[PDB]
Design an enzyme around this catalytic site. Structure first.
Site: not given
Ligand code: CL
Ligand code: CL
Ligand code: CL
Ligand code: CL
Ligand code: CL
Ligand code: MG
Ligand code: MG
Ligand code: MG
Lengths: 195, 195
Positions: B105
């Site tokens: 991420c």
């Molecule tokens: Cl986040």
């Protein structure tokens, strides 16, 4: 805001619990976590050892006006839910007062069936526990929404996104469900609520 | 007896952290969670408010012989990692000693790129942050494994299963990855390690 009561017990499945909480918060739903079957202790050791702190004991929040009560799976957590008279009576009260019951993985078979909470409802749950759900009530589907009884069920850790998104759709609306889905980098196969 | 060091910080993305931990445990990998909170606090509030207990402060476990170091995302958790000299030194030491770095991420763009830990190699991360990963390194894939530098990266909460399964492959192998995948009821778009 819409609101959700997410129950946790020793042995709850941590992906199911945490992914559901995360998605509901992303959807703008206020989430309270409740400790079940721990005599008030807020420390909850989940099924693969993950340790969560719940917000409150169930007995202190069970009479709250949350829009949905969420039952994660996990074998031992679901047994704790089944054997908690407060948990079972809270689920029944959510239903009678027109609110949503949401259960995933082992929770449908372990909690809802033995207590005959939804005697003719349609439901799913973990596939290897198919034999614990009465045959005429069983659907083998990632998520089942029985709108007649306001019962949302789902199958396993890998359907936790699908489960959380349907809660968002029901409480907040389709556009918010799609907004949240769009943030996740979801696998192909999962419904994204664009249509 | 493979082992993984999973780092946690205030603001870590709880799905990424918890789903990864869950899958590694299912795969028979010994997991230790390490707090990177600046004060050593172990009771971590994640990005959507989930309260997660870390096993140990990083300083007490960083020199361990874990096969992989895992960096969850979450905007503010990744910033904490970036700004921790011990975290950065530990990641560099895993890499220089021939071990695996795994990041998801925001962690690639926030931690790895600014510290220039992987000047050569392919990587991915959250797609809104793709302009912070050098263009010659970026790939838009759910998981990127660059064996040349032993760098595993992945994109977001919805790729946490793919990420965890690839760690299992890299530590334990394809059979175990398939075994774990088969437990999850995961979506058809996630590679299941069966051929
Ligand atoms: Cl986040
Ligand atoms: Cl207490
Ligand atoms: Cl209680
Ligand atoms: Cl019914
Ligand atoms: Cl998923
Ligand atoms: Mg019956
Ligand atoms: Mg609709
Ligand atoms: Mg460069």
């Amino acid at each position: 805001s819409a609101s959700a009561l997410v129950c946790l017990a020793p042995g709850s499945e941590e992906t199911e619990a945490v992914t559901t909480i995360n998605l509901l918060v992303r959807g703008g739903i206020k989430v309270t976590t409740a400790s079940v079957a721990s005599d008030g202790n807020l420390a909850i050791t989940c099924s693969r050892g993950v340790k969560l702190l719940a917000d409150a004991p169930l007995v202190e929040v069970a009479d709250g006006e949350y829009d949905v009560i969420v039952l994660p799976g996990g074998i031992k957590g679901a047994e704790c839910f089944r054997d908690s008279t407060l948990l079972v009576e809270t689920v029944k009260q959510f239903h009678r007062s027109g609110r949503i019951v949401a259960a995933i993985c082992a929770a449908p078979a372990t909690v809802l069936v033995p207590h005959d909470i939804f005697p003719i409802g349609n439901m799913t749950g973990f596939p290897t526990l198919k034999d614990k759900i009465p045959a005429e009530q069983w659907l083998d589907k990632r998520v089942v929404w029985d709108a007649r009884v306001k019962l949302l069920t789902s199958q396993g850790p890998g359907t936790a996104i699908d489960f959380g998104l349907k809660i968002i759709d029901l409480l907040v609306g389709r556009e918010k469900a799609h907004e949240v889905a769009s943030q996740l980098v979801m696998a192909a196969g999962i419904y994204n609520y664009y249509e």
